Amino acid sequence: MILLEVNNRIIEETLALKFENAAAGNKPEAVEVTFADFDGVLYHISNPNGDKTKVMVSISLKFYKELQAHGADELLKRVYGSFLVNPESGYNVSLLYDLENLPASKDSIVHQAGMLKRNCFASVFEKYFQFQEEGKEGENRAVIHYRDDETMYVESKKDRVTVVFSTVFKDDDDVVIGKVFMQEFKEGRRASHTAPQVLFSHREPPLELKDTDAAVGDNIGYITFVLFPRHTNASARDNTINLIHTFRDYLHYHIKCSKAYIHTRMRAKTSDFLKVLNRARPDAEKKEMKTITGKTFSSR
Amino acid sequence: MDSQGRKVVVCDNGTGFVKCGYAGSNFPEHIFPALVGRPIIRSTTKVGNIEIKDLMVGDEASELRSMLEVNYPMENGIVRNWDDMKHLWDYTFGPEKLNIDTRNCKILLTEPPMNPTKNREKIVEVMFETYQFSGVYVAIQAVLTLYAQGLLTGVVVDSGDGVTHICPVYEGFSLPHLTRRLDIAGRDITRYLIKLLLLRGYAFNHSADFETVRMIKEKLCYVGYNIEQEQKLALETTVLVESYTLPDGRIIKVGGERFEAPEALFQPHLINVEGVGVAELLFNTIQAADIDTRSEFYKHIVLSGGSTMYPGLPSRLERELKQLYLERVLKGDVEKLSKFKIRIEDPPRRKHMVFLGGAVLADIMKDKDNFWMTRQEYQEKGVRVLEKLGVTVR
Numbered sequence: 001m002i003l004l005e006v007n008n009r010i011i012e013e014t015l016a017l018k019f020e021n022a023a024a025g026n027k028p029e030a031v032e033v034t035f036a037d038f039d040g041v042l043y044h045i046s047n048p049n050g051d052k053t054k055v056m057v058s059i060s061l062k063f064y065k066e067l068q069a070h071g072a073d074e075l076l077k078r079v080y081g082s083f084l085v086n087p088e089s090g091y092n093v094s095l096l097y098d099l100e101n102l103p104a105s106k107d108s109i110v111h112q113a114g115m116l117k118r119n120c121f122a123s124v125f126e127k128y129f130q131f132q133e134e135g136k137e138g139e140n141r142a143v144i145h146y147r148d149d150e151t152m153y154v155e156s157k158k159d160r161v162t163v164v165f166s167t168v169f170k171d172d173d174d175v176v177i178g179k180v181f182m183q184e185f186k187e188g189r190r191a192s193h194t195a196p197q198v199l200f201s202h203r204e205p206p207l208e209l210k211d212t213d214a215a216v217g218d219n220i221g222y223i224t225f226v227l228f229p230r231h232t233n234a235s236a237r238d239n240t241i242n243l244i245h246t247f248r249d250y251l252h253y254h255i256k257c258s259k260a261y262i263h264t265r266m267r268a269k270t271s272d273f274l275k276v277l278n279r280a281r282p283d284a285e286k287k288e289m290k291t292i293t294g295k296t297f298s299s300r
Numbered sequence: 301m302d303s304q305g306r307k308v309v310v311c312d313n314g315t316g317f318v319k320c321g322y323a324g325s326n327f328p329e330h331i332f333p334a335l336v337g338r339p340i341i342r343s344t345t346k347v348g349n350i351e352i353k354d355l356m357v358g359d360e361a362s363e364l365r366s367m368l369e370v371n372y373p374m375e376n377g378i379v380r381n382w383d384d385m386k387h388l389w390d391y392t393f394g395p396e397k398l399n400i401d402t403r404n405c406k407i408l409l410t411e412p413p414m415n416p417t418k419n420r421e422k423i424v425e426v427m428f429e430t431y432q433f434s435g436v437y438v439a440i441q442a443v444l445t446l447y448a449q450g451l452l453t454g455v456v457v458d459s460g461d462g463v464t465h466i467c468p469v470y471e472g473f474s475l476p477h478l479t480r481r482l483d484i485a486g487r488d489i490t491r492y493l494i495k496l497l498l499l500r501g502y503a504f505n506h507s508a509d510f511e512t513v514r515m516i517k518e519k520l521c522y523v524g525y526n527i528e529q530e531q532k533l534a535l536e537t538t539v540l541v542e543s544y545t546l547p548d549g550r551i552i553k554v555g556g557e558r559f560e561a562p563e564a565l566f567q568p569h570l571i572n573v574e575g576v577g578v579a580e581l582l583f584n585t586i587q588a589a590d591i592d593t594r595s596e597f598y599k600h601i602v603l604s605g606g607s608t609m610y611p612g613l614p615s616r617l618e619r620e621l622k623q624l625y626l627e628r629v630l631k632g633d634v635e636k637l638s639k640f641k642i643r644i645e646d647p648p649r650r651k652h653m654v655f656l657g658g659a660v661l662a663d664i665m666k667d668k669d670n671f672w673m674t675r676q677e678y679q680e681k682g683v684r685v686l687e688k689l690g691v692t693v694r
C-alpha cells in the first residue's frame with residue numbers, strides 16, 4: 001500500500017454483516033462498536049435506546065465548528081438522504097439505518113457509509129470549490145482544524161484555491177525525518193506534467209497567514225498547494241479532495257515506513273561487516289559432517 | 301577388616317550417587333550414580349551390538365542411558381522405590397562392584413537428618429533380612445563430615461544431589477534444634493537448568509536427557525560472586541557463551557544460564573521455594589545458637605557434598621555472610637567489619653567427606669560389640685534394635 005485509502009474497513013464490515021443478517025431473515029442481534037480513525041476521529045456504531053432494529057453510526061471530528069457553519073451540510077445531505085439524523089449526544093454527525101427499510105443493492109449505501117469522514121471533510125471543503133466555480137473573488141477563506149496542533153488554511157479566489165498545511169510532528173525522530181520528507185516535496189512536480197504548484201517553507205509563515213489564527217511557530221512547516229481550475233473542476237475534484245484530505249496522514253505513514261525500509265539496508269551492511277570480521281577466524285583443518293538436525297553423520 | 305575376618309564396609313547411599321568402600325580407606329573404592337534402568341526402544345536411537353541386560357544398574361546404567369529408561373530409587377533422601385533400591389544394593393555388593401559375602405560382613409550406612417523414621421526402619425529391616433548382614437550402624441552425616449575434616453566443632457553445610465542440610469556441632473555435642481534442612485540441591489538445580497535451556501529451544505524431556513543436563517551443569521555452570529556484576533557481564537558482553545557437545549552430536553550454547561541455574565541455592569524464589577538461601581539460612585542457624593558458640597561457629601564453616609563444588613561457591617558464601625553480618629550485627633559499621641573473621645573450610649576432596657568420616661569412624665569402632673546392631677538383636681527385638689543408636693522407636 002502506497003497511497004492511503006479513504007474508506008474505513010470496520011464500518012463497511014459491520015454494516016455489511018448486519019445487512020446480510022437482516023436480508024437473510026434472521027432476528028437482529030445487539031451491536032455496540034466504538035473505534036477511532038486518523039486525525040483523532042472517533043466512531044461509534046450502536047443502537048438507539050436498545051432498539052435492536054435500528055443501527056446508528058455516529059462520528060466525532062476535530063473540525064467541530066467549521067461543519068456547523070451554514071452550508072456545510074449540502075454534500076452530507078445530498079449523499080445520505082434520509083439516513084442523516086440528529087447527532088448522538090457527544091458526537092458530531094450521525095447516520096441511522098433502519099434494518100427493515102433497507103433498499104435493494106445494499107452495497108452502495110455501505111460503500112458510502114465507510115466514507116463518512118471523507119464526506120464530512122469534503123462537505124466543508126466543496127464550499128470553496130463552489131466559491132471559485134461561480135466566478136466570485138474574495139469569497140470566505142477559513143482554517144480547518146483537521147487536527148489538534150496542525151491546521152489547514154483554505155482560501156478561494158476568482159481563479160484558484162490555495163490550501164496551506166501548517167504541520168508539525170510529535171516525535172523527535174519523526175521531526176528529523178519529516179524535515180527531509182517535506183524539503184524533498186517540491187521534487188515531485190517532475191513526475192507529472194500537471195501537478196499543483198507546491199511551495200514549502202519553514203523559515204517564516206506565508207503571507208496568507210497574517211490575518212488568521214492558523215498555527216504558526218518555529219517548529220512548524222508550511223506546505224502550500226495552489227489548486228487551479230484544472231484540479232477543482234466538477235470532474236476531477238473527487239481525487240483532489242481525497243489527496244488534500246489524506247496528505248498529512250500519507251506523509252506520516254511514509255515517514256514511519258522509511259524506518260522499516262532503512263532497517264533492511266542496515267542488516268545488509270551488518271552482514272557485510274561480519275564478512276570482514278570472518279577473516280580473523282582461522283579455517284579448521286577437518287570438520288565433522290553432521291545432519292539437517294545437527295546429529296553425528298552416522299555413516300561415511 | 302576386624303579381628304574376626306568380617307569386612308567392615310562403608311556405603312554412603314546418596315540420592316544422586318553411591319560412594320562405597322572399606323573402613324580406613326582414604327578414597328571411595330567405587331563412586332557410581334544411583335539409578336536403575338530398563339531397556340526400551342526409541343525411534344531416534346539405533347544400537348545393535350552392545351549387550352543390554354533386562355536390568356542395568358549404576359555405572360553401566362548411566363553410560364548406556366541412550367538405550368534405557370532410567371529412574372532413581374531415591375529422592376530427597378527418601379527411598380521412593382524399594383525394589384529398584386534392592387536392585388541397586390544387589391549390584392553394589394555384587395561381583396562387578398564391592399565383592400563381599402554379606403552373611404559375614406558389617407556395614408556402615410548413613411541418612412540425612414530430619415527424615416521419616418519408617419525409612420531408616422525399613423533400610424535396617426532390609427539389611428538384616430535380605431542381605432542378612434552381621435552388623436549395621438546408621439551414623440549422622442554431619443558427624444561423619446566433622447570426623448573426616450578432623451574437628452569437634454563446626455557448622456556442616458552438606459549440600460548433596462538430593463537435599464541441602466545445615467547441621468552445627470559444638471565441642472562434640474549435637475544441637476538438634478538448630479539442624480536446618482532446605483530441599484534444594486543438585487537435582488532441583490538440574491531441573492531449573494532444564495527449564496532455562498527450554499527457554500532457548502532445546503528440549504530434554506526423556507529420562508536419559510536428565511543425565512545429559514546433569515553433566516552439562518557439572519562442566520559449565522558456576523555460582524556468581526557479585527550477581528549484579530554477573531548480570532552486567534551476561535547482558536552487556538558475550539564472554540559467558542560456551543558450547544557443549546551432546547552425546548548424539550548436537551552442539552548447544554549455554555550463556556547466562558551458567559550462573560542462573562546454581563543461583564537457586566542462594567535465591568530459592570527462582571524455583572518457587574519460599575524461604576531463604578543457603579547463606580541466609582546458615583546465618584540464621586548460627587544466630588539461633590547461644591551467644592558463646594557463634595564466634596566459634598563462624599570460624600569452622602565446613603562445606604561438604606558434591607553440590608558445593610560450583611566454581612566460586614565458597615567465596616560467594618563468604619561474601620554473603622559478611623554482608624549479612626555487617627547489616628544485621630554491626631548495624632552498618634564498616635570499621636568493625638575488618639575484625640570479623642570467617643573461615644569457610646572447603647577441602648579439595650569435599651565431594652566425599654561423608655564417606656571419609658564413615659571410614660574413620662568404622663576404623664575406630666570395628667572391634668567393639670556395643671557399637672554395632674547385631675543380627676541376633678534384630679531377631680530378638682525387631683525394629684527396636686535401632687534404640688541402640690539413640691533414636692527411640694518401638
Ligand SMILES: Nc1ncnc2c1ncn2[C@@H]1O[C@H](COP(=O)(O)OP(=O)(O)O)[C@@H](O)[C@H]1O
Pocket residue numbers: 312313314315316317318459460461462463486487490514517518605606607608609610651
Ligand atoms: N562439580 C560440580 N558442580 C556442580 N554440581 C555438581 C558437581 N558435582 C556434582 N554435582 C551435583 O551434585 C550431585 C552429586 O553430589 P553428591 O554429594 O554425590 O550427591 P549425593 O547426595 O547423592 O551423595 C550430582 O547429582 C550433581 O547434580
Ligand SMILES: [Mg+2]
Pocket residue numbers: 312314315460605654
Ligand atoms: Mg551425601
